[PDB]
Amino acid sequence: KPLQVYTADNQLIAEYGGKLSIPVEYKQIPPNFIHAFLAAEDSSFFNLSKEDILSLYVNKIFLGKNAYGIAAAAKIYYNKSINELSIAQMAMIAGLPKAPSKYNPVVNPERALERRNWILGRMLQLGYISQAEYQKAVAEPINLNMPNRDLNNIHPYAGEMVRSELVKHFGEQAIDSGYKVYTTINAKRQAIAEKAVQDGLEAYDRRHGWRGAEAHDKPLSEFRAYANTYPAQVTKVNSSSFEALMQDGSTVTVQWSGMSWARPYRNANSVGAAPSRASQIVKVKDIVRLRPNEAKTAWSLVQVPKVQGQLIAINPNDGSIEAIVGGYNFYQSKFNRALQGWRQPGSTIKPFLYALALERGMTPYSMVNDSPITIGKWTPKNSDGRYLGMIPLRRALYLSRNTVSVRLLQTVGIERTRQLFMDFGLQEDQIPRNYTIALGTPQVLPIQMATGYATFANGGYRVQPHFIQRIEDAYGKVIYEAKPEYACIPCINAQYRQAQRILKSSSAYDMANILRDVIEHGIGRSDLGGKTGTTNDAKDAWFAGFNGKLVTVTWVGFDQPTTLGRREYGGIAALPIWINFMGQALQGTPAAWVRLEKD
Amino acid sequence: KPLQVYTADNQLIAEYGGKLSIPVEYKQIPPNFIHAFLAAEDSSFFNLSKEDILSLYVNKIFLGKNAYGIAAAAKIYYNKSINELSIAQMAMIAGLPKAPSKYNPVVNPERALERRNWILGRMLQLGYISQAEYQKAVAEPINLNMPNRDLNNIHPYAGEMVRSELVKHFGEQAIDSGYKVYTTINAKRQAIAEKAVQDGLEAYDRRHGWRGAEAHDKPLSEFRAYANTYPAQVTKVNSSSFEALMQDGSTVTVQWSGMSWARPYRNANSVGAAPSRASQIVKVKDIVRLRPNEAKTAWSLVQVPKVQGQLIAINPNDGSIEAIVGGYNFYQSKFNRALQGWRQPGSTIKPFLYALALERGMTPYSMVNDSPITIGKWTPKNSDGRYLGMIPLRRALYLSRNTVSVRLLQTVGIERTRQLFMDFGLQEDQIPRNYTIALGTPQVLPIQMATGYATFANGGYRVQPHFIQRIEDAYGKVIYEAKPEYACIPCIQYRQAQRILKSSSAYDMANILRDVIEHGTIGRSDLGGKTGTTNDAKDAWFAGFNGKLVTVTWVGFDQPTTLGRREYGGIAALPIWINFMGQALQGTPAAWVRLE
C-alpha cells in the first residue's frame, strides 16, 4: 500500500513506498538465515529458546531503511526473497537488529562488513557453515541491489511536489498512510509545460553557444540519458562529420547539419565564429549528447542547458495548480524552482504597486512624472538613462519606468505597499522597508507571483494555491475534499467559501486591460494579458500573464545569479516558454476575459 | 500497553514504555495547538487547507522520543495533557514533525528554541496570538518535564535482564510488542539475594576502611540515592560532628557514633589510625553518603563499596533462574556481573576436574601426590608455598592443592576436561589447550559456574539457564511457553537433558562437597559447596547447592586488584551465599542427590 499520486484526469503518476513489512511463515525461513541470527550474539538465556522467541519478532524487527522483518530487509537491501539471499547477505541482515543505523550497509558499509564477518566467523565455529562457505561469504562484497521505492517517472515535478510537501508538513509517517492523493494537476497541461520549459531553455542555451563536451576520456556507462538526450563517446572525427558509440552499442554518424550550430560560447554576451570543421567541436574520447529525429534516421549534437527555468500555472478562480515544472529536468535534482527558487521579481512586481495607485484614485490615463528623482542619498535611474516627463500611468507601466514606480511608492506609502504586497501573496520578512521595493527587490517564489497575478484575472480576489483535490484511504473512502476559497462562486457552475477581496473590481479590471494592452503592443487569442520582468544585469527573465481561466508565470535564470546577457533584458527568454504553454494549453477553449456582469 | 515483567508468583515488577500514541478527537484539540502547526512552515500549498489535512495526521505524526501524535508528545516532553500546554509548549511540539532529531529539545535545546521562537513569531504575524501572548511565550524557558516511562524499582536487575536481553537479540520492537514476560524469578528469593549482596559487600568494604568522600565540590543534583544511602553535601565540620545538606533541602547532623568507624584506607592490607576528630574524615563541600535509622531519627556516615559482587541462583533440574543480582545496586552500576562479568574461577573449577578423576575410577579416598612438579617449562606452585605429600583426593580438593590438580589433569587428559567445561556453557575460545586449566584460568561467567555445579546437584546432567517461563501478548494469549531440558522428568511432553557426567561421579562429588561444607567450613544436611580463590586473591567465590537450588556468589574489583592478604579462600563470598541459602531454603524439606 504505497502513497499514490494521481492527476486531475485519473492517471496514476507516482507511488511512494514507506515502512515495509512482508510477513513469512517461520518454517518457510532458510535454516542458514535462522543460524545467522543464532550466531549474531555471544550468549542467550531466554538454541531452541532463542529460535522460538525469534519467531515472535522475525517479521517485525526493525532492520533499517524502512525494513520491518527479514523479508522486507531482503526486498529493500537486495531486491530478493529470503530464499535468494547468500550466506554473506543473511549474516549482514542478522547483524542489524542490535543497531540498525550503526551497522547499516548504506550509511556505514565499512562497519557493516565488520559485523557481518564476525557473525560469519561465529557461524563457522558453531558448525553452521563450512570453511568453504566461510571463505566465499567473507570475500563477498556488500552486493547491495536496492529497488526504487519512489516510482515517479511520468510527470516527476508533480509527483515529487506531493511527496515533498507531505513530508515537510507531516514527517515521514505521511508516506506510510497508503493514501491516494488526487491532485489538481492537468496531465495534458503538465506535459505541455514540461516540453515548453525544455524547449525554451534549449533555445536560450543554443544561441549562447557550444560549451564543449561534458566529459573527456570517462567510461560511457557512468552517464545517463534524460530530456531526450543520449550520452555517446566520440570515436572518429572527420572533416564534416563524426562517429560516436552509443549506449545501445551501435555506432552512429552525426552529419554536418547536426552540429553546425556549435559556435563556441565565450561569455553570456559573446560567441565565437561558426565552426568550419568537426574537429573544432568534438575530439575523439569526448562524451557528448545526441538526439535523434522522429524515426531515428538522423542524429544531432545537442547540449544540456546550464541555465535553469520554471513554469507554474494556476486557475485564478480557486488557486488550483494545473501544471508545475521546477527545472530543466528532474534527473538534475529534486529542487523545484516554482516552490523553492527565491529570486527577485524586478519589473514583474510593478503591476502590484501600480494597482495600489489605481486603488487610490488614479486611472490608466492619469499623467505621471518620469523625471530625475533623489530620496536622501538614493538616485534611482531608469534602465535606459532617459526621462520621458509627463506620461500616462499605462505607458509608465508598459515601459517599466523606475522613477515613476518610486514616485508612486512615495505617494501611496511604503507600509501600505508592503501590506498590499502581502495581500497579493508575497512574504512579510522578504519585503524590505525602503523605496527599492518599487524596483522589485523583495525575494519571491514564482508561485507567489502567480497568486498575485490571479488577482487581476479574477476581479480583485486573493486565492490560495492548492494541489490536492481529494484524498482517499487505501480502501476508497474519501477522507479529505478540497474546500478552496473561490473568487467567483457562480463561475463554478459555468461554492461555500468566498475569497477575500484585496482590490476594487475597477482597479483589478483596469490593470487586466493595461496588461492586455502590454501583450497586444509587443498566440491567436484576444483574452490574454501579461507583464515581462527583468532584474539588474539581466540576472532573471520573467513573464507573468493570464486569461480568465489560467495564470502562468515563467522564469529563466542561472541558479548562481549571473547575467543572462545584455540582449536578454526584458524577460526575453521567459516569454517564448509562456507563449508556447499558453497557446497549447488554451487551444480549443473559448475567449475568457474579465467578468463585468456575472457576480 | 508497555512490555511487562512478572515474577514466578505473577506479580508485576517492571514496565517498559515503548512507542506511544494517545489518539484524541479533533474537536478536543485547543485552537492554539492547531494554529502552532499552521504557523510551523512558511508556505502551505495543499493555512485554511492545512487545517483539514492536519486532522488526518495529528494523532500519528512522529514527534521524537517515541511520541506519535500530539497527546503522546504532550505526555512525553511535558507530562501534560494537550489542553494544559502553554502556547510556547505547543509551538515547541509543532516544530518537531519536519526533523524530530534536529529540533529535539533534549538533544538540541538551542536549535529547538530557535525553531520554537520562529513559529511563535509566525503565530504573531498570522494573527493567531496577540503581542502579549507572544512576549510571554518567547520569554518562556524550554521547561521540559519528562516522565520516566521505564518503571523498574522493585527488583531492578531482574527487570533489566528481561529488557536488556530482548533489545540485544531483537531490537527496540521488543519493547513496542506490549508482551507480558512471565519470568522464572522467585520474588522472595530475589529480595533475599539483593539484601545478602548489599550487606556482604558492605562488610568487606568496612573492614578495608574509609576511602574519603565520594566526590568533592560537585553538584549534589548529580548524585542518586540507592541501597538505603542518601548523597549529602558537607556544609559544616565541628570537632566530633558535621552538618550536611540533603537532596530535599534539609540539613542533618551526624554525631560521633555515626562516623567513628572511619579508619583511613592505606592499601588492600593496611588501614590507618582510628580518627579522633571530624576534620580527619570529612571537609566542607565533600559529597558523602548517609544512612538513616529504622524509622528516621539519626543519620550515620556510610560508604558505597568500591568492591563488586554478584549472586546467581538456579533450579538444577531445569536451569530456571530463581534470583539474580548483578552488582551492589543497579542504580550504582547497571552492568550485570552474573551474565557479563568474565572472571577467572580459580579453585572454584577444581570439583569439575576432580569429578573427571572419579569418572576414571579414582575415589574420594585415592592417595594423590601434592609435591613439586614441572611440565616442560611450566612449574605450577601451591598458593601457600607448602607441599603436603601423599593425601586423599578429597583432602587435595578441600585444600585446593595446585600440584594435585595438575597431576589429575595429566591422568584425565586436557581434551576430556575441555569437553566437560564446554558441556556446561564454557566458551571454547575461552578454554586454553594447556595445563593451566587445572588452576582455573579459563574466563568464565558466574552463570556458567552455576550450570556447572547444577551437574552435581542434578545427578550429572546438562541444564540450560533460562529466565522466561512464558510470554503472553498484550491481550493475555500464550505466545511462548518454555520447554526446558530436564535432568529428572518424574521430579516435575518433557525434554530429557543430556548426561555429561557418570551418575556415580556426580553423586560422589556432591558428597565430597557436602563433607567440605559440613566439616571444613544453616541447620541443614542437604548442602554441598566449594570456596573459590584466584592468584593474589583477585576473586572470592562460593559455589554450592542442595538438590533444588544452586547458588554461586562472587566478590572482586571490576579493575582486577587484590582483595587483600587476609581475603583468600573465598572469604568475602561465603557469608553472602550462607545468608541467601539459609533464608531461601527456610521451610523447605531436605533435598539431596540420587545415585542411579
Could you name the key traits of this structure?
homodimer, 599 residues, alpha+beta, Beta-lactamase, OB fold (Dihydrolipoamide Acetyltransferase, E2P), six-stranded mixed beta sheet
Walkthrough of the structure:
Chain A has a six-stranded mixed β-sheet with strand order 3-2-1-4-17-18. In chain A, strands 5, 6, 7, 8, 11 and 12 form a six-stranded antiparallel β-sheet that branches. A five-stranded antiparallel β-sheet of chain A has the order 14-13-21-20-19, with helices on both faces. Chain A is built from 17 helices and 21 strands. The longest helix of chain A has 21 residues, at 187-207. Helices cover 31% and strands 16% of the residues of chain A. Chain A starts with a strand and ends in a 13-residue tail after the last helix. In chain A, helix 1 packs across helix 4 and helix 9 (187-207) runs antiparallel to helix 17. The first copy, chain A, has three domains: 1-18 and 149-209 and 305-599, Beta-lactamase; 19-148, no CATH class; 210-304, Nucleic acid-binding proteins (OB fold (Dihydrolipoamide Acetyltransferase, E2P)), CATH 2.40.50.140. Chain A is of the alpha+beta class and 599 residues long. Chain A is globular, with a radius of gyration of 30 Å. Chains A and B meet through helix 2 and helix 7 of A and helix 2 and helix 7 of B.
